[PDB]
Amino acid sequence: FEGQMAEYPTISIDRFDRENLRARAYFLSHCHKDHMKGLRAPTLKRRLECSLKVYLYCSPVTKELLLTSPKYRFWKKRIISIEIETPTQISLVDEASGEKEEIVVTLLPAGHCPGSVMFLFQGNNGTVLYTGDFRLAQGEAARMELLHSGGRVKDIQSVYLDTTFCDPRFYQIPSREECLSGVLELVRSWITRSPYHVVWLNCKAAYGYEYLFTNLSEELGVQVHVNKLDMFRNMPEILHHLTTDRNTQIHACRHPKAEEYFQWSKLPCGITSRNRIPLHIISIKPSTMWFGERSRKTNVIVRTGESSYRACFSFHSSYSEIKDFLSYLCPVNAYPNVIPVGTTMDKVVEILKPLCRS
Numbered sequence: 001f002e003g004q005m006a007e008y009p010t011i012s013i014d015r016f017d018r019e020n021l022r023a024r025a026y027f028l029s030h031c032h033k034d035h036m037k038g039l040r041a042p043t044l045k046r047r048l049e050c051s052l053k054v055y056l057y058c059s060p061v062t063k064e065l066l067l068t069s070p071k072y073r074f075w076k077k078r079i080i081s082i083e084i085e086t087p088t089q090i091s092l093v094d095e096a097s098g099e100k101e102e103i104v105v106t107l108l109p110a111g112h113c114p115g116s117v118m119f120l121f122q123g124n125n126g127t128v129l130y131t132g133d134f135r136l137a138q139g140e141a142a143r144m145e146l147l148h149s150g151g152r153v154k155d156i157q158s159v160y161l162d163t164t165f166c167d168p169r170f171y172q173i174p175s176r177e178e179c180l181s182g183v184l185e186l187v188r189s190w191i192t193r194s195p196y197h198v199v200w201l202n203c204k205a206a207y208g209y210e211y212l213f214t215n216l217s218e219e220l221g222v223q224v225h226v227n228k229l230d231m232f233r234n235m236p237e238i239l240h241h242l243t244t245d246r247n248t249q250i251h252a253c254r255h256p257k258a259e260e261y262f263q264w265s266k267l268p269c270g271i272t273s274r275n276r277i278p279l280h281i282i283s284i285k286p287s288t289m290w291f292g293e294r295s296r297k298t299n300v301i302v303r304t305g306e307s308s309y310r311a312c313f314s315f316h317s318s319y320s321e322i323k324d325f326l327s328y329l330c331p332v333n334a335y336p337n338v339i340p341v342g343t344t345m346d347k348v349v350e351i352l353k354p355l356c357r358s
């Protein structure tokens with residue numbers, strides 16, 4: 001996926017370079033780097049300065065997060081949030097020939113990271129859904145009222161969908177709740193032993209772990225150490241569960257060579273003792289795990305060393321979830337947004353084919 005859906009080529013979503021430089025309107029599903037290619041390129045800025053009626057649309061949270069970065073503040077005058085599950089009419093003007101197109105857009109929650117949404121577009125060339133990145137459990141799409149008309153799913157011409165784990169190997173992934181419970185109980189069994197027992201959550205430098213931090217903090221009464229928390233300045237229910245102070249039993253700090261540090265009983269922020277008593281440190285790396293069709297779930301926690309663990313965590317839907325979602329949507333066409341590492345377009349397209357009307 002390179003930004004443009006065939007049905008509405010004058011809009012660009014999650015890609016801002018190359019052909020997307022002529023967009024009549026821009027959309028951002030969420031603040032992950034690989035969906036923000038070109039979003040602050042000079043050539044785009046140049047183009048915004050001679051095209052005054054071009055806006056960027058996203059969720060309220062996405063607006064807030066994007067605008068906390070100094071490098072995207074230039075968007076301030078041109079960003080419009082759209083409320084979640086609130087169908088909103090948008091006008092797309094031709095800068096030169098003066099053509100006018102109207103589209104109605106509805107934001108649906110994607111379950112991927114703070115601010116993450118799917119965009120349902122309705123207009124005079126059919127209904128389309130761009131999912132962005134999503135993780136939706138079975139039944140979640142069936143509950144989304146604005147995907148339906150008169151008790152049946154809307155007629156959807158094309159779905160542009162997150163196919164990150166769209167291969168039958170990734171058949172099942174433990175739920176959000178199961179992942180959280182496993183991590184909670186591992187952390188609780190360690191940090192309640194003494195004040196000197198500490199956990200390092202080894203996380204990627206990306207939004208989407210806040211669900212985990214918030215819940216661990218709420219349940220355990222401990223704030224989580226992070227490198228930077230200023231992006232949540234106006235998000236109290238996230239902010240108050242994080243800290244920049246090193247004196248805490250849960251850390252999600254980050255440092256360029258941080259797994260070497262852990263192999264010498266140092267956390268990334270450098271704290272190794274308190275009252276000259278060494279901290280007893282375990283590492284927990286949230287990581288995607290999956291089970292095949294014919295298997296049962298195994299433990300969300302995998303022990304990798306005396307003091308090291310992997311914990312199930314997924315930003316994206318399983319293959320069974322993708323199939324259930326698309327089966328339910330029953331669009332005419334389905335377009336993979338991404339080719340999983342070990343497969344091809346043809347295999348992914350052909351996996352999806354039987355779930356579509358043409």
Ligand SMILES: CO/N=C(/C(=O)N[C@@H]1C(=O)N2C(C(=O)O)=C(CSc3nc(=O)c(=O)[nH]n3C)CS[C@H]12)c1csc(N)n1
Binds near residue numbers: 032164203
């Ligand atoms: C290499 O180190 N790996 C992991 C780990 O477990 N990674 C998982 C793996 O193999 N994954 C897959 C995928 O298949 O690409 C991905 C999908 S790639 C992607 N996801 C987005 O949401 C997005 O917006 N853009 N992009 C490009 C997620 S990580 C996961 C890790 C976890 S924590 C930590 N410190 N390292």
Ligand code: NI
Binds near residue numbers: 030032112133
């Ligand atoms: Ni993402």
Ligand SMILES: [Zn+2]
Binds near residue numbers: 226267270
């Ligand atoms: Zn730390």
